[PDB]
Structure formats: C-alpha cells, structure tokens
Amino acid sequence: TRFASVYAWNRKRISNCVADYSVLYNSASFSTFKCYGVSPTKLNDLCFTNVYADSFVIRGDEVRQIAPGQTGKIADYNYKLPDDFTGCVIAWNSNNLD
Amino acid sequence: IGKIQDSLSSTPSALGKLQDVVNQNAQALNTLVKQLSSNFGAISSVLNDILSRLDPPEAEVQIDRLITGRLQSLQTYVTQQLIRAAEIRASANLAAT
Amino acid sequence: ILSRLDPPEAEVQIDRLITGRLQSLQTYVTQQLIRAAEIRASANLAAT
Amino acid sequence: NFNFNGLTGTGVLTESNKKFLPFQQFGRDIADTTDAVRDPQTLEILDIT
Fold first, then answer.
1. Cβ–Cβ < 8 Å for A47, D9
2. Whole-number Å distance between alpha carbons of A43 and B43
3. Reduced to 3 states, what is the DSSP secondary structure of residue D43?
4. Which of B43, B71, B83, B89 to mutate to test the interface with C (most CBs of C within 10 A)?
5. What's the DSSP call for residue D33?
6. Which residues neighbour C24 within 8 Å (Cβ) at sequence distance 6 or greater?
7. In this structure, what are the phi and psi dihedrals at residue B74, rounded to the nearest 5 degrees?
8. Are C15 and A68 in contact (CB under 8 A)?
9. A-D contacts at Cβ under 8 angstroms
10. CA nearest to A43 within chain B
11. Is D31 on the interface with B (CB under 8 A)?
12. Are A40 and B44 within 8 A, CB to CB?
C-alpha cells in the first residue's frame, strides 16, 4: 500500500510465513512464473532454493556501444552496485488498474 | 662394508634424484586437478556451472568458452608427460648397459 | 582502444588478442625444450 | 538420490565423526571439494566419498 521515497523502501520478511512462488504466479495480478531465461546451465549454485527478500533500484543504460571489461556510467549515485551480470530478469509496463 | 653402511645411514641427501622424480609427477597432478576452479572468462568455475541454472539461447554461447578453455590444459599435460618419458627411456638404457 | 573509447566497450577484441598472444608462447617453449633435450645427449657423448 | 542443502539433485555423502566449530557450514578438502557436512535436524557430522 505504501511506496515512499528511496529512504523507505518496502520489505517482505522471512518470518512466520509459508507460500510458494506458485501461489504468487497463480494470481491474476501477475502473469508469469519465470524470469526471462532460467534453464539447466550456469549461475545458481548451492543447495538452496530462491532469492532473499530485499528491494532496491539499479541502472543499466550503456550496453549497446559496449563490450564489457571496464567502468560504466549510470549505476552509482544513490545506491551501491556490484558487477557480476547473469541470470534472470523481468521488466515490462503496467498502466491500467491504478 | 661397515664404512659404507654407516655413511649411507648417516647421509640423507643422496636420494635427491629418486625423490624429485616422484615429486614432479605429484606436483603436475596437483596442478591439473587444481586447474578446474578457473572461470575462463565465465562467471563461475564449478563443474556444476554447466548443469542446472540458466537459459539455452544465451547459455549455449557461454558454455562453449568453458569447454574450449578446459582442453589446452589436457594438451599441455600430455606433452609434458611425453617429454619426461622420452628422457626416462634413455636413462633406463644407460642403466641397463 | 582505451583513451578515445567509452571504457567497457572492447571485450571481444582484447580477449581474443590476449588469448592469441598467450598461445604463441608455449610453441617457443616447446622448441627450447626439444633443443635442450638433444643438447644434453650431445654433451653426454662428449663427456664420455 | 536426495540429501544436500536446499533443493533438487543427485550427489554424494558418507558418515563421519569430526569435531566442528558451531558456526561453520561447509567442510572442504585440499582439492577444494566438499567432504564433510553437518545437519541441524540432528547435529552429527556427515562425510563424502
């Protein structure tokens, strides 16, 4: 219900809680049960399940005139960022029900 | 005879050749097994890093780098073994003569 | 490549270049090994 | 078949009697390979072969 400024980001906490991502995608508000690409190869490993529950904002602009190995431009100022890039990403628009 | 028995019992540094012969092979094997933990430009180096974790149409262009990076490590090892055996043969012929 | 380009722009070039340059070394190393191996036998014959 | 840290797979484990520090989670060998594990269900130690 409350989406304040950067100082008051929301949080889900792992405490007295049980439901799978199956329940989360079974709803009509969301419409996917993946990210844009996860299959039997290359990043995820210890015997372990999911992602932890924290929320933040990052940036990724300069990628097209780019072949990696050096320093970027955008993802610095208001929150610190690591470097490693691989895995699953979901991002698309929504402008209807609010 | 007693003199040489006592001298051999005393001096421990006469068997350096026989020691280093085994040491070289042990070190080579240790290096070869250790090499598996290198990323070779990928994100991860575990053997599991090609098993259960990311999509085909972007990971097939990534696993190839790892598989082609792991082969020269075998090539160098076999060449080294070839050279070592080549010289050991001449040593053995000299001993037999 | 570095001083006039935006930094993270030249992976697929520098990586191929460094791999190729590295590959050129072991050949020379192997040639030296073979030559030294032959020289050892020559020296043994001379000593005898 | 199935006993490791948190979902699917086919692996390797054996029994052990090692003395462990209470906070450590992994036990690895010289070859940078896991060879000793501990479980919170009951606090015994399990090995690998």
1. yes
2. 7
3. coil
4. B83
5. -
6. none
7. -75, -40
8. no
9. 12
10. B53
11. yes
12. no
